[PDB]
Amino acid sequence: GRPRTTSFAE
Amino acid sequence: RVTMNEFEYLKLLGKGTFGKVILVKEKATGRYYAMKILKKEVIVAKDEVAHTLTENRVLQNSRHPFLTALKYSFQTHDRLCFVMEYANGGELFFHLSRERVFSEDRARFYGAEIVSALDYLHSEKNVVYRDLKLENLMLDKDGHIKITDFGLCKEGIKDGATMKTFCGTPEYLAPEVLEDNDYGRAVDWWGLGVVMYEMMCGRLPFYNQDHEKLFELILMEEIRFPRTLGPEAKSLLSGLLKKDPKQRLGGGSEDAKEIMQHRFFAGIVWQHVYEKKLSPPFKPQVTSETDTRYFDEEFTAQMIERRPHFPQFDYSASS
Ligand SMILES: Clc1c[nH]c2ncnc(N3CCc4[nH]cnc4C3)c12
Ligand SMILES: [Mn+2]
């Protein structure tokens, strides 16, 4: 029941 | 010949910073689809153009039972839109947030489908996916995997060729990416390992809320193995989450074929996986084609040069 993650690109 | 007018907009399925996805029905056919709608100006400002073109090509060029099929791509004066198969079963993230863990057999089933898709992207399409995670693994109406969200894919990666972009999702990043090394298609088997670990252990193998301390765990610590985990599952997780990609399961020239061989997958028949002949351990229990009980309430409960032309963005599938 973890928090939702966020995809990224640098 | 497709425009916003060709569809009705029914339920919001998703909305992040670049755009949104809506359950729609096509007026001429009565068929239901998911439409991802991007505002051109926001894509240009947020620097998402090259990601959007990648996603357009990857969808156009891919044909696989566990990859979201593209029906239309079309633009208006201010929007880019993809019309894709609707995955009625929602995100694996949804299911696993409510059930805590999957049985080894259930995890094995999704894992096999994921491996099948990844193997096709790598081998047939020269594509590395890079952002495998629970959030972007959906289930269709029969309960099979659909991979969505191709924007972080790398194209033109043939065999063990390498890449440099620091991209993905923090909690899933492979060590070789964090080391600022050139990295190969084996990053997708690290992702696979993290997904499979979450499925069968009910948490991430490396966890700290703060991305930076998390990265330290990824480079420094060995994974823990709950005592309920069987010896095959243990060995698979340990092989996929090897920190050196050269030592990783799937990290050699055989790529996916090495994972497919692994004893955890014994008596998975890979050709039946592809032909969709394996029995899904979970069938989404929907009333209608518009029942979105497997999607998050936050979204479904909502009521429905700066803007350049994108050359030849338009596409229509057929036979
Ligand atoms: Cl894109 C897309 C194609 N087919 C879909 N069927 C349901 N939902 C979808 N989206 C909404 C939720 C979600 N979660 C992660 N990516 C998505 C995209 C899509
Ligand atoms: Mn985070």
CATH number of the domain at B18, please: 3.30.200.20
The helix-helix angle for B104-123 and B231-240 (nearest 10°) equals 30
Question: What's the helix, strand, coil split of chain A in %, to 5?
Answer: 0, 20, 80
User: By what method was this entry solved?
Assistant: X-ray
B238 and B180 within one domain: yes
B56 domain-assigned: yes
Structure tokens at B93: 């993230």
Residues with CB under 6 A from ligand 1: B 13-14, 21, 34, 36, 68, 84-87, 91, 135-136, 138, 148-149
B318 domain-assigned: no
What is the DSSP-derived secondary structure letter of residue A4?
A: P
Asked whether the beta carbons of B190 and B240 are under 8 A apart, the reply is yes
List phi, psi (to 5°) of B54: -55, -50
Query: Which residues are registered as beta bridge partners of B163?
Result: B183
Distance from the CA of B68 to the center of ligand 1, in angstroms?
A: 9
Asked whether the beta carbons of B54 and B46 are under 8 A apart, the reply is no
Q: What is the domain range of residue B144?
A: 91-285
Residues in chain A within 8 Å Cβ distance of B136: 7
Query: Which residues are registered as beta bridge partners of A9?
Result: B167
Total domains, chain B: 2
B190 and B230 within one domain: yes
B15 domain-assigned: yes
B107 domain-assigned: yes
B294 and B281 within one domain: no
B143 and B51 within one domain: no
CA distance B282 to B60: 29
Resolution of the structure, angstroms: 2.0
Query: Which residues are registered as beta bridge partners of B80?
Result: B38, B75
Chain-centroid distance of CA B244 in Å reads 23
B143 domain-assigned: yes
Which sequence positions of B are flagged as catalytic?
Answer: 131
Nearest to B240 by CA among B132, B81, B93, B86: B132
The helix-helix angle for B187-201 and B231-240 (nearest 10°) equals 150
Distance from CA of A1 to the nearest CA of B (A): 4
B131 and B58 within one domain: no
Where residue B245 sits, what CATH number does that domain have?
1.10.510.10
